[model samples]
Target: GEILRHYAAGKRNFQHINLQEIELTNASLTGADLSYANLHHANLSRANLRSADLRNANLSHANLSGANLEEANLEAANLRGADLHEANLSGADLQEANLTQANLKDANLSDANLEQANLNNANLSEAMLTRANLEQADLSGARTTGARLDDADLRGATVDPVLWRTASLVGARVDVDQAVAFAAAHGLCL
Candidate 1:
């Protein structure tokens, strides 16, 4: 209520606000400024958060399945253990964000900036990551089965051998040795 009221009052910046465990499913928060807000364990499934400012926000264990976060600023945000299945994060800035153990199955991350993000143990199965920036990102123990990595930048990214073997890496930019090993592991002569 306070959030809605403040939003209705033409206040765009809601930085450092605590909304933990709140239920805001399908809420219209388009273009809202929520930078550095605490949203841990919140239910924001199917919410409209397009172009919202979520930089450095705490979204750990939050339910954001099917939420629209396209072009949102989530730089350095903490999304550990968050449920983001089928979420639309295309073109969003998630640089250096913590997504450890997050559920990102089937999420659309195309053209997103995820440079240096921590995606350890994150479920990225069937996720669309076309042209996404993953430079220096930690993908160790991440599940990338059937995930699209077309034209994605993975230079200096840390990917486990198992995850690398399962990912679809058509036109992805990765380390030469890793690519060769992945190809050899799959019996593909590259």
Candidate 2:
């Protein structure tokens, strides 16, 4: 009910609420508290969500293209099937988040925290992930052509062994990059 109200009213103030499937595309919600909120199927493309709190939120299938999520907190959030192309996620926290099948092409993830996050089947072509934390994150089936992971931490991360050898990710955690590059080189783009 409340979700519907906010959606109908075009309100982007969905602080800590259960607003599943609320469509607020291009809305101005710069600093909303979406912690633990259910936003499954919500359309937030181009929304101004800079510095928003989305800890433990469910954002599966949500559209976040071109959205401003700089410095946002998305720890443990579920982002499966979400479209995050061109989104600004610099300095955002994505620890333990599930991002399966999400489209993150050309997105800005520089300095973002993705420790233990699941990125299976995600598309990350051309994304800027320099200095990001990807320790223990699952990267099976994640295609990240032309992405930059310089100085990133990938200790204990799951990556295709073949891909690691061929990929160019200077300054990345040595062992992790080697494993992924090796997998990629052997056609194991898992």
Candidate 3:
């Protein structure tokens, strides 16, 4: 409420605000400054958060499905258990973000910077990750079935063999051992 009030008052910088469990679904928060805010369990589904500054924010268990987070700065944010299904995160900066157990099915993560992000147990089935930077990211137990990983970088990423086999890896850059293991698991003689 306070955040909304401040927003209504023409304030764009809501950095470090406590907005836990707030319902901001379908709200227009484009280019808003919400860095370090506590938004745990908030309902932000379908929100227009394009280019929003959410670095280091606590968004655990938040509902962000269908939200437009394109070009947003989410570096080091806590997004564990968040619902991000079908969200538009293209070109977003998610470096070092904690996305454990998050739902990101069908999300558009093209050109996103997810380096060193914690994606353990995350659902990324059918997600568009084209050209995404996932270097050193932890993807153990994450679902990537039919996900578009074209030109994506997976160097040093920790991926489960089974899950990695189901993803589209055309033009993706991964460790040689990881590629060999994925090929062996999928019965490809490479």
Candidate 4:
């Protein structure tokens, strides 16, 4: 109510505001500042939040299907169990974000900075991660079936060997030793 009213009033900065479980579907909040806000379980499906500042925000169990989050700042954000199917996160900054168990099926994450992010058990099936930086990230138990990782930097990232079998790593960079090891385990020469 208040958030809707303020948005109608042209107020875009909502840093540190408690808006948990807010239903903001199809809302356009481009360039809004929502840093440290509590948006737990919020429904923002099809919403446009390009370049929004969502650092340190609580977005656990939120629904962001088809949302446009291009160039958004989500560093250290809590996004466990969030539904992000078909969402566009190109050029977003998600360094150190907690994305445990998050659903990102078919999402576009090209050029996104996800260094050190926790994606344990996250579903990234068919997602696009071209040119993304995932250095030192945790990807234990994460699923990447049919996901495209073209030119993505994954050096020093911890991942389950299951990912190497299912993900498409065309031109993607990984640790040389680990790549060779996994490849050998899979019976590939070098």
TM-score to true structure, per model: 0.94, 0.83, 0.94, 0.94
- How do the residues 77-167 of candidate 3 rate in per-residue lDDT, one tens digit apiece? 9999999999999999999999999999999999999999999999999999999999999999998888898999999888888766688
Worst 10 residues of 2 by lDDT: 160-169
lDDT of 1: 0.91
Which lDDT value does model 2 have at 50? 84
Q: After aligning candidate 4 to the native by TM-score, how far in Å is the CA of 70 from where it should be?
A: 0.2
By descending TM-score, how would the candidates be arranged?
4, 3, 1, 2
What RMSD does each model have against the real structure?
A: 1.8, 4.5, 1.6, 1.6
Which one wins on lDDT?
3
lDDT per residue, candidate 2, 1-190, as tens digits? 4444554575656656766777778886666677888788888899888888898888998899998898999988989999999999999998999999989999999999999999998987888878999988988888878777778887778777533642356777857465556556767766
Once fitted onto the true fold, the runs of candidate 2 whose alpha carbons sit more than 4 angstroms away are 1-15, 165-167, 176-190
**Which 10-residue window of candidate 1 scores lowest in summed lDDT?**
181-190
Tens-place lDDT per residue, model 4, 64-119, is 99999999999999999999999999999999999899999999999999999999
lDDT of 2: 0.82
Global lDDT of each candidate: 0.91, 0.82, 0.92, 0.90
